[PDB]
Design an enzyme around this catalytic site. Sequence first.
Site, PDB file in Angstrom:
ATOM      1  N   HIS D  53       0.938  -1.165   0.000  1.00  0.00           N
ATOM      2  CA  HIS D  53       0.000   0.000   0.000  1.00  0.00           C
ATOM      3  C   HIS D  53       0.980   1.217   0.000  1.00  0.00           C
ATOM      4  O   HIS D  53       2.087   1.176   0.594  1.00  0.00           O
ATOM      5  CB  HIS D  53      -0.753   0.166   1.370  1.00  0.00           C
ATOM      6  N   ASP D  56       2.571   1.861   3.374  1.00  0.00           N
ATOM      7  CA  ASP D  56       3.524   0.886   3.899  1.00  0.00           C
ATOM      8  C   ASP D  56       4.970   1.351   3.508  1.00  0.00           C
ATOM      9  O   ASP D  56       5.923   1.047   4.234  1.00  0.00           O
ATOM     10  CB  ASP D  56       3.346  -0.500   3.267  1.00  0.00           C
ATOM     11  N   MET D  87       2.158  -5.854  -8.084  1.00  0.00           N
ATOM     12  CA  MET D  87       0.834  -5.223  -7.720  1.00  0.00           C
ATOM     13  C   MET D  87       1.110  -4.170  -6.657  1.00  0.00           C
ATOM     14  O   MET D  87       2.051  -4.285  -5.859  1.00  0.00           O
ATOM     15  CB  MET D  87      -0.035  -6.372  -7.106  1.00  0.00           C
ATOM     16  N   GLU D 180     -11.231  -6.119  -4.569  1.00  0.00           N
ATOM     17  CA  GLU D 180     -11.184  -7.238  -3.582  1.00  0.00           C
ATOM     18  C   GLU D 180     -12.383  -7.176  -2.648  1.00  0.00           C
ATOM     19  O   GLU D 180     -12.544  -6.231  -1.840  1.00  0.00           O
ATOM     20  CB  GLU D 180      -9.921  -7.062  -2.713  1.00  0.00           C
ATOM     21  N   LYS D 182     -14.934  -8.324   0.554  1.00  0.00           N
ATOM     22  CA  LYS D 182     -14.872  -8.810   1.971  1.00  0.00           C
ATOM     23  C   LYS D 182     -16.275  -8.569   2.523  1.00  0.00           C
ATOM     24  O   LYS D 182     -16.834  -7.484   2.242  1.00  0.00           O
ATOM     25  CB  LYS D 182     -13.799  -8.043   2.791  1.00  0.00           C
ATOM     26  N   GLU D 216      -9.994 -13.256  -2.003  1.00  0.00           N
ATOM     27  CA  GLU D 216      -9.132 -13.763  -0.933  1.00  0.00           C
ATOM     28  C   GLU D 216      -9.799 -14.962  -0.286  1.00  0.00           C
ATOM     29  O   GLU D 216     -10.962 -14.957   0.065  1.00  0.00           O
ATOM     30  CB  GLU D 216      -8.936 -12.701   0.180  1.00  0.00           C
ATOM     31  N   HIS D 219     -11.737 -14.388   2.972  1.00  0.00           N
ATOM     32  CA  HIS D 219     -12.971 -13.484   2.896  1.00  0.00           C
ATOM     33  C   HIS D 219     -14.189 -14.195   2.450  1.00  0.00           C
ATOM     34  O   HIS D 219     -15.285 -14.048   3.035  1.00  0.00           O
ATOM     35  CB  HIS D 219     -12.615 -12.286   1.985  1.00  0.00           C
ATOM     36  N   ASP D 244      -5.502 -13.543  -3.518  1.00  0.00           N
ATOM     37  CA  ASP D 244      -4.863 -13.500  -2.212  1.00  0.00           C
ATOM     38  C   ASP D 244      -5.044 -14.875  -1.505  1.00  0.00           C
ATOM     39  O   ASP D 244      -6.189 -15.283  -1.248  1.00  0.00           O
ATOM     40  CB  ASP D 244      -5.482 -12.457  -1.287  1.00  0.00           C
ATOM     41  N   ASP D 254     -11.560 -12.039  10.623  1.00  0.00           N
ATOM     42  CA  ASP D 254     -10.583 -12.393   9.490  1.00  0.00           C
ATOM     43  C   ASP D 254      -9.243 -12.801  10.133  1.00  0.00           C
ATOM     44  O   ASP D 254      -8.495 -11.976  10.671  1.00  0.00           O
ATOM     45  CB  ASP D 254     -10.476 -11.136   8.658  1.00  0.00           C
ATOM     46  N   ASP D 256      -6.463 -14.528   8.607  1.00  0.00           N
ATOM     47  CA  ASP D 256      -5.258 -14.395   7.771  1.00  0.00           C
ATOM     48  C   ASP D 256      -4.169 -15.383   8.200  1.00  0.00           C
ATOM     49  O   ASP D 256      -2.983 -14.999   8.306  1.00  0.00           O
ATOM     50  CB  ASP D 256      -4.764 -12.930   7.809  1.00  0.00           C
ATOM     51  N   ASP D 286      -1.611 -13.070   1.419  1.00  0.00           N
ATOM     52  CA  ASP D 286      -2.051 -11.924   2.290  1.00  0.00           C
ATOM     53  C   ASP D 286      -2.324 -12.608   3.656  1.00  0.00           C
ATOM     54  O   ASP D 286      -3.433 -13.150   3.877  1.00  0.00           O
ATOM     55  CB  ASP D 286      -3.283 -11.213   1.742  1.00  0.00           C
TER      56      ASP D 286
HETATM   57  O1  LIG Z   1      -8.667  -7.543   5.232  1.00  0.00           O
HETATM   58  C1  LIG Z   1      -7.752  -6.580   4.672  1.00  0.00           C
HETATM   59  C2  LIG Z   1      -7.146  -6.945   3.338  1.00  0.00           C
HETATM   60  O2  LIG Z   1      -7.407  -8.090   2.685  1.00  0.00           O
HETATM   61  C3  LIG Z   1      -6.079  -6.133   2.666  1.00  0.00           C
HETATM   62  O3  LIG Z   1      -4.795  -6.704   3.012  1.00  0.00           O
HETATM   63  C4  LIG Z   1      -6.214  -6.022   1.169  1.00  0.00           C
HETATM   64  O4  LIG Z   1      -5.812  -7.233   0.468  1.00  0.00           O
HETATM   65  C5  LIG Z   1      -5.245  -4.931   0.666  1.00  0.00           C
HETATM   66  O5  LIG Z   1      -5.712  -3.599   0.886  1.00  0.00           O
HETATM   67 MN   LIG Z   2      -6.466  -9.410   1.029  1.00  0.00          MN
HETATM   68 MN   LIG Z   3      -8.196 -11.185   5.220  1.00  0.00          MN
END
Ligand SMILES: O=C[C@H](O)[C@@H](O)[C@H](O)CO
Ligand SMILES: [Mn+2]
Ligand SMILES: [Mn+2]
Lengths: 386, 386, 386, 386
Positions: D53, D56, D87, D180, D182, D216, D219, D244, D254, D256, D286
């Site tokens: 991002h 970051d 990306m 993306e 969610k 993802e 998600h 992702d 979430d 991850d 991710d």
């Molecule tokens: O839940 C947050 C995300 O998945 C984030 O990492 C996106 O992939 C990128 O902004």
């Molecule tokens: Mn993601």
């Molecule tokens: Mn996630």
Amino acid sequence: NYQPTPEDRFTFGLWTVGWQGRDPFGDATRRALDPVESVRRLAELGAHGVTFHDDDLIPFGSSDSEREEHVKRFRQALDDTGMKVPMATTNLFTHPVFKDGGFTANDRDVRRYALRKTIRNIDLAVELGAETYVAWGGREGAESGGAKDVRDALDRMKEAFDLLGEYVTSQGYDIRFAIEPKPNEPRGDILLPTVGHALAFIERLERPELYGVNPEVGHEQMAGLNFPHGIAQALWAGKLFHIDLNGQNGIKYDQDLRFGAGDLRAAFWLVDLLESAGYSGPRHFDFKPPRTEDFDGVWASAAGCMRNYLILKERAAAFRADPEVQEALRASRLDELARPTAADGLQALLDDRSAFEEFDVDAAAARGMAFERLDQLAMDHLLGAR
Amino acid sequence: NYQPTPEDRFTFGLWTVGWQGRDPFGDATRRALDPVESVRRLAELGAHGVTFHDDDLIPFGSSDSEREEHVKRFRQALDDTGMKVPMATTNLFTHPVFKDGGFTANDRDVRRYALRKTIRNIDLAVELGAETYVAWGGREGAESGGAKDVRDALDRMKEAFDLLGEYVTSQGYDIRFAIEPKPNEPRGDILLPTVGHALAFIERLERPELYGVNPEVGHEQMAGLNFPHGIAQALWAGKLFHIDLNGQNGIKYDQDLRFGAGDLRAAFWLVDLLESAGYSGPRHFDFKPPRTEDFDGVWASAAGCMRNYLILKERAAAFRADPEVQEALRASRLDELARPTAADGLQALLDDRSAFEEFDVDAAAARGMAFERLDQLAMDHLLGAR
Amino acid sequence: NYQPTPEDRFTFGLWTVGWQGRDPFGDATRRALDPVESVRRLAELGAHGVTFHDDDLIPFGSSDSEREEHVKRFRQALDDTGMKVPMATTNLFTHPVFKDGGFTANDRDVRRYALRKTIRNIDLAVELGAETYVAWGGREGAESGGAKDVRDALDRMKEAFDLLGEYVTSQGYDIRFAIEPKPNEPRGDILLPTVGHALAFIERLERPELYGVNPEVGHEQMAGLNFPHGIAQALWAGKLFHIDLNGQNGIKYDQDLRFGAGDLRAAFWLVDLLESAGYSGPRHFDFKPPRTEDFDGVWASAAGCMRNYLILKERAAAFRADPEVQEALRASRLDELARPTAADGLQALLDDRSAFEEFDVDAAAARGMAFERLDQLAMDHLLGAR
Amino acid sequence: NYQPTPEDRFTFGLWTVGWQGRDPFGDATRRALDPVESVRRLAELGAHGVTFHDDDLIPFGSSDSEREEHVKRFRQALDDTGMKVPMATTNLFTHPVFKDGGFTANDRDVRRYALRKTIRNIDLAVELGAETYVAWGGREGAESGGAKDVRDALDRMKEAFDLLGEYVTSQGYDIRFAIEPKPNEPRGDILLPTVGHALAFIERLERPELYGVNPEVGHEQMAGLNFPHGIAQALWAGKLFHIDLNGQNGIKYDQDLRFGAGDLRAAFWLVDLLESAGYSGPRHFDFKPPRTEDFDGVWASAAGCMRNYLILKERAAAFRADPEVQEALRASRLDELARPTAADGLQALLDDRSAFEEFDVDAAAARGMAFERLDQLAMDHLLGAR
Ligand SMILES: O=C[C@H](O)[C@@H](O)[C@H](O)CO
Ligand SMILES: [Mn+2]
Ligand SMILES: [Mn+2]
Ligand SMILES: O=C[C@H](O)[C@@H](O)[C@H](O)CO
Ligand SMILES: O=C[C@H](O)[C@@H](O)[C@H](O)CO
Ligand SMILES: O=C[C@H](O)[C@@H](O)[C@H](O)CO
Ligand SMILES: [Mn+2]
Ligand SMILES: [Mn+2]
Ligand SMILES: [Mn+2]
Ligand SMILES: [Mn+2]
Ligand SMILES: [Mn+2]
Ligand SMILES: [Mn+2]
């Protein structure tokens, strides 16, 4: 018009209206509130009292001197307002040392530290007049299977609670413990995940009479369970020592919405049960005003918690007092559910031909329960559509 | 190559391989199987025994004459094959009379009927050599809040189980009861919805020693809970009397897939725990071959249940015996979780400056738990990728 | 007092009040209802019309003669009552032949059969005056990963819907299709599981203008999604052709409770949106009176569906018309959400220093959204507590 | 032994291994990592590249001078290691200004700010060689019903994406967008909650060819959906631009987790599909190493992501190449699913008596699908138990 007074026993955690709005994906949106200001503002809205974790009142790592100062200012605000402190608890989850738990961390030294931090706060709680001490083991659990042997972790959890009971007994304190379940978040799975698991665990402690539960609306809803049913089981066991009221929209992260938001019908059935059973403990709100709000929004959200409890109390009372409802309850045989199945005893039951040999199964099966009519009466009462 | 034998103690309900495939939206896709044929086919696959509800073996409404005939044929098939019957249960859910429940129906006459039907089957179970009698209260619950006062329903449930304990005691039978929880389906909410709620309830019965739990993989997963954690709590309490093994894909309708399908990692951790704790009861499968299959598919699905348990047993055993794993367990301090926090006692803990006053919180906090490396060793062992 | 009339456009499926109460664990608790009786009883309660699957009206396997007779009796009851038939659909899920699906079964011969059965019913629907033809692919999906290649199944689903569009076009019929999503049950996973997936699929058909969606309250709630948000996306795309209204308590089996039960706040927000957007299609109820009820309970449940829609309509209208609410909407900047971000165009935006270089981020961040006050006004209006 | 190389196209976000461990209930457990160090460590483990991002790489509020310096150091580390940047994306969720959203905030000035911050980062991404630009609208949504009119919010979201497409077109850049989805967290409900909703939305943009999805794993699993099925629909539409990869244990916050943890069978079916369909984009992770770990644990977790993808690739390839599997696929009629239902056309279908009039429904219904045998072959291949 649904105005609360101290007699309604409404209480709030300092961490509730004091939440700065930091979430997993964002920075704080509000400045920190001094505990003295929260006591004054809550008293103006009609609350009865406040609760705290050790770390909400005295900043972690405070010297004894600083500690005394923080307490003194707090005690002054309570005296000035007439607010009480009915419950306190310990923070065993924020500091990095507790990353694998407090009472059930794999490291023995951390487990001894967690016990000492807890005991220090029990002394303070008693000084402030608390009657209940809550324990939420938010870091007790795991993200992977090999990381925690659950049998050994339950031995460690029992050992910790037994030591705490020995401490209060030896000191002659008049305080009881209430364990608060949660199924997940922040750990992947948390130990004692529901009210059932916490009730079962209490029965294996050395002095079970000292411990009960502190259920929270949204936690049992994170497992998709019926909250009023869980509270009825806790009341049946005589272990509803305290309660956390809020809202949640189903199975997802712990939302902590204001009470009345989330599942409104379940809020109605919960108030009906607490008032019918004569629960006499605090009506405590463990909620977070959303991070979209400023300070005006914080106090509007806190006031809404109490307003919704009062509207629901009025509607549940009107429901139970309506003669048409009393009739529908008998139509659905709620009166018969309350009578013993076989007060006559086992032998009499075995000898009763009307219970088996000559029981007309088809006739009993055709009898409708009339539950839909009863539920629509309850809907009409909730909506004020009678 | 992962071939089961009677010594593995694998058992199946008659209703499992016998499921005709009727679902809420469709007719049966398979013809009914005679119980004698299922006993013979299961014995050929290497099973140890079978279980039944009363109504699976003797058609509802059978005359005493017909009843004797059904039993005799069944007993012949057991003698012919060497199969055993380690558990039995009652159907208190299919007939329309049980639409509001058996033990907790609002109608008193139905509750007395449910008890008599149960007692009749306990006698039969004992005759066939069963050691455990399961109770799944699938109709005990509600779709709406006013329909059931849960405190009164728990009084009725306790009354029923107490009468059953008085019956077995008076008869001198060597049988114990196992209550099977489920959170929902077919009722909107079912009473005693999880293993925790069932364990807590048992502690209020008159002779708690007679009762334990019969947890099922997919039922605790319908509430999003960790099944191996729930089993560890039941083992800790000394109440794992029997188990139902199957698969489920998350929070949805009860799927009853074959064991190993659904959450495969949770299946691995479950086998690891049953084998490490030395569980010695039956490995019972409560599953349904999908309605897409013919009879060839039914027996392939049943064989797959046993094969997957045997592969997982081998992989969990290889995991625990690997020296590199034993080292990683010590790296993550599993050895320290098993030692008492304070065998020294309360006073010693209170006097120990290393537990608080001089505890270095930052040093303890910086210590990594090394859980990811341990979990990847477990993944490599499951996959046979060492 | 909240009395419906035909002008409210309330409709019911024959299969709703006609559900006999067979569930995965129990036999029917009610006798079958003749379609003629349901038309008469619904007309007395104030409904506008009824809908049907082919198999609800004409028993599967009926001769042409029997078929004509069933239709004639039905048409007489419609003429006698003034009831209309605004929608019809096909049963491609009950018969065993459809165990792996209709349009996406692996067997090609079954897919051709499913298309012919569908076309036969489109002709009938047109004869009866239906404007919308629903398709719910309840058997399109899988329990295991290798059983269905989803890319090939979507090719087959597109092929089927394209052929159906060619048929209606060639015949000159004035009927449109509405696809109804569901995430699971009876298959482990169903294809096109939500409104989003169905909208995306429609865009790849040959004549997209002929197809829309038929969302159902409880289906999107089985995936934990916000139903009013899903309906707003369908309205935005111009594809809300029909709707199924009912209630559901979270993520579990498809309950099909009466409308207003389940998530009451989401019911309020749904009515607010349908009435504000001027949806003019039928208000169809796809519900099941619980199997605990007799026939009196069936009609009470059906009447409750319509009553709750009318109470919610009144409360949402009072909310939107209150000057204090209109003020709170401007306080929360709903008026600004409705204005274009950059009607000035890209270049103007790029040249605008007030949008970046000189934008005061801290001042904008401190502005509260005042959402809690707005939501409490909405709660007070729902409860009739203004 | 399952060693990755740059040719495997494995990539990681800077925010993944760089996560300090702050959660809703706890402080950071790890120090911040410099982006240069993460590039070097990932290159040693065999990764192909990294993503970021804006915030970051360049600390929010950095001067142009500081900005240039941060970029230069980063570009040096890429040159030194041969790592690529395929990306990039924008942070429109951490700063308090975005508390009600970026593209759909109610405040118009915030929406213009969000667009400018995005455009600035597109320029940088192109300079670094990125081919895909992701947009995750984590703050686009609501906690209450009146706070957001979804139709107006979708107009605003479309307006933003249209402006972004006009920008890239005008500049002549070779970059495409990937949205993306969610379903929730951090907002109560997020707009475009699943892959279906995002695909449907893209079809209403002015230049749909420029936009695809970035699904993802965890998600879609937060809504209880089947991830491989969702990916098959994205591939069918030609819109799988990026992915992702991670793990999640069901419906909850979430998580991850590292790839391969969570639902292992779904991970197997996902790899099978990506490799069979010839997906040629990055395999991006991710994930978040759990806060229990130190830096050694971070790199072990990152290495485990790549190892599990390689083991699963080998097992899926062995499955598809086994002659016994190829035979079982024909036994279950996967070959017939791939053939057109009616290449003969509508008229031919209507005239075909074998499709209806003379179709033997009972014979077709009795044919078993042989799915259980096929699924057990897949289980044996995953476990290396052939
Ligand atoms: O839940 C947050 C995300 O998945 C984030 O990492 C996106 O992939 C990128 O902004
Ligand atoms: Mn993601
Ligand atoms: Mn996630
Ligand atoms: O989810 C966190 C909590 O519920 C917490 O506020 C406890 O009630 C007190 O430690
Ligand atoms: O969901 C139903 C059950 O689990 C049932 O098979 C019990 O195990 C036995 O009555
Ligand atoms: O869950 C089943 C359904 O929703 C069904 O009633 C469709 O609406 C009509 O085929
Ligand atoms: Mn909470
Ligand atoms: Mn709480
Ligand atoms: Mn089950
Ligand atoms: Mn079972
Ligand atoms: Mn439904
Ligand atoms: Mn429907």
